């Protein structure tokens, strides 16, 4: 659950 992972 990484909010800074690739969101695109």
């Amino acid at each position, epitope marked *: 659950p990484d*909010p*800074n*992972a*690739n*969101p*695109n």
Partner: antibody
Amino acid sequence: QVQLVESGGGVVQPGRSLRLSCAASGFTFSNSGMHWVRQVPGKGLEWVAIIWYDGSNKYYADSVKGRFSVSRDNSENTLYLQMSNLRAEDTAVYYCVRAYFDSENLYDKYGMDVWGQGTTVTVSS
Amino acid sequence: DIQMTQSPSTLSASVGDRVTITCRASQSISRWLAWFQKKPGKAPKLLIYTASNLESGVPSRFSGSGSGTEFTLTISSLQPDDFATYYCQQYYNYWTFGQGTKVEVKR
């Protein structure tokens, strides 16, 4: 040009609700994660929320958790921020901000690139 | 929560000066540090990403360096477009900003 145009700002009474929107153009909106960031008068810049490109994952700042909800309508190139139980401390310029777009997927962590010019929300009686 | 601390809060300089601004993270953020330029009444503009990589519109008099907790933005020869407030931002764990460094005109 990558363009982000916020709307919906205005005066809201404490405890009430307000929805902001952000119209995107100049890029494929449905492929980008999106953020809201605010600046309260006299305070620094403060991240508010992120939403994944497809609207699956959503995360929020502790200061708005349980009160704000982020959503998007990719078919209309629009980002939303639903604010509820508003208080004086939520008075701020609210910015729509695109998550950093990297077509090569080079890096392990993601920030932000393009900012809109903001819309102002004033919470007051 | 990672705290970002910039130094100095205000810097006075002249056109042609070499300018250095520092940013410190409260814990290690590797190279996940960005620098933004902001002018009064205008939206921030991304200048440097991944600590040291210039965005393509940015003139090469700007450079960034650092990894871990200590980062610097350098302008090798200040130009009139560069008078502004500069913010650092970590994007290792959520997103937090320094308080800003205002680069003002010396007279």
